[PDB]
């Protein structure tokens, strides 16, 4: 029945708008039917996340933060074989900075969420692996992932 | 949609357009309106198609298989079912009227000549209003006269010259489609001849000489007019 379905739809909009609503827009996915969704719903999803126009927030413009893309340990295995898995490991981490400029003099202290208070030891930027291009569509060569 | 079809405004948006044919398109009544709509023989538009392909209907001595086939004034429409013969005749109020006739009356029709000349190799010919051109007519047959047609062949069995004081049907104009048997013939600028008409109540009415169709003598009409 659509009428019990449509009544359940407005019960979920008028629930969700009590908490979030800035113009908030939730929409309806069809089904997982083949490990995948119909392409119109994926387009309307990818449309709605492309017109989002984010505001900046108060905590994010005071604290330099980043998300770790890939995790790398840089220790000699001879340090590991001698000291016998007791060592605290020299670790290189990779990510995109955010928010405010993280100062490049090594020695600022900086906190992994869920590990503890650490400090930086050596800084190095790189060319980013996913560049923005440099009223046309994107060429499919230029849409590009990094995983 | 025109006036004389007696269609409702209901039952579907688009009006069934007429095909090109013998009659004029504004004078025509298509067979789709004739079967499913006024005579109520069929229901859907597709049901008209099944009647035509099985050749139930014959119009004026021909098979005549077409959905939007233009039927006009004075057309013998013979249906092989029921042994009934139909002749279209216009009604005074502005509309067409389907009419019952006999087998002998389904044999003949009347036809107004529109133009007469001399054909090739010295042959006279007259051209009826239904576009039936006929070789070797009577030289008495001249413009605006009616022609009785055999319909077994294309031959002419009777002819009535246009003379004042004979029972006239009107095909066109404002006062289109009455009896009234003649007052006289007027001349005017540009032609525009107004053949005057005085009805059963003896009232003057005025249409064009183009609209004049002689349906009989003072007294007798040659065809069975519908009485009501």
């Amino acid at each position: 029945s659509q009428s019990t379905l449509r009544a359940s739809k407005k019960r979920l909009k008028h629930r969700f708008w009590t908490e979030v609503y800035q113009g908030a827009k939730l929409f309806y996915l069809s089904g997982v039917i083949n490990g995948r969704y119909p392409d119109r719903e994926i387009l309307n999803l990818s449309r709605f996340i492309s017109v989002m126009k984010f505001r900046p927030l108060k905590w994010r413009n005071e604290h330099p933060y980043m998300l770790a893309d890939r995790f790398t340990d840089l220790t000699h295995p001879e340090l590991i074989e001698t000291q016998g898995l007791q060592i605290d490991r020299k670790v290189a981490i990779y990510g995109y900075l955010h928010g405010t400029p993280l100062p490049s003099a090594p020695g600022t202290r900086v906190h992994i969420a869920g590990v503890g208070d650490f400090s930086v030891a050596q800084i190095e930027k790189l060319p980013d692996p996913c560049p923005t291009p440099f009223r046309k569509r994107l060429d499919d060569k230029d849409k590009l992932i990094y995983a | 949609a025109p006036h004389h079809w007696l269609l409702d405004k209901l039952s579907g948006c688009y009006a069934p357009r007429p095909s090109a044919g013998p009659h004029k398109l504004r004078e025509s009544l298509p067979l789709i309106v004739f079967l499913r709509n006024r005579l109520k023989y069929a229901l859907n538009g597709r049901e008209v198609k099944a009647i035509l392909m099985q050749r139930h209907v014959k119009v004026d001595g021909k098979v005549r298989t077409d959905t939007t086939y233009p039927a006009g004034f004075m057309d013998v429409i013979t249906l092989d079912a029921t042994n009934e013969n139909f002749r279209l005749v216009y009604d005074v109020k502005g509309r067409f009227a389907v009419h019952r006739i006999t087998d002998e009356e389904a044999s003949y029709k009347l036809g107004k000549v529109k133009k007469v000349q001399l054909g090739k190799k010295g042959v006279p010919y007259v051209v009826t209003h239904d576009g039936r051109t006929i070789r070797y007519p009577d030289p008495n047959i001249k413009v605006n006269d009616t022609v009785k047609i055999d319909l077994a062949s294309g031959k002419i069995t009777d002819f009535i010259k246009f003379d004042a004081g004979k029972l006239v049907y009107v095909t066109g104009g404002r006062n289109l489609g009455r009896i009234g048997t003649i007052v006289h013939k007027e001349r005017h600028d540009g032609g525009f001849d107004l053949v005057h008409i005085k009805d059963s109540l003896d009232n003057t009415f005025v249409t064009r000489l183009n609209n004049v169709f002689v349906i009989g003598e003072q007294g007798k009409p040659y065809i069975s007019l519908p009485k009501g």
Partner: protein
Amino acid sequence: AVTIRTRKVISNPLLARKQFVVDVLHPNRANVSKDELREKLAEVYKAEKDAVSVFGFRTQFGGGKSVGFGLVYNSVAEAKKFEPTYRLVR
């Protein structure tokens, strides 16, 4: 059981069929389930069910009755020739 009344029994020999408006009376039941009428409209005549065709049943409001249109052909092989395909499948 059910009871049927026929109004405007009109014969159309072009399609070689008996048309009529069907006036179906529902004393208590719910409805009449058109296959049951194609049974009952057959045996009121000689029809051998599939030479009848009932389609236009819109109910009297509140129940109790339904009005529609019935097409009874002759020569049952003609039902394949003149009926539409969406009534052959019913």
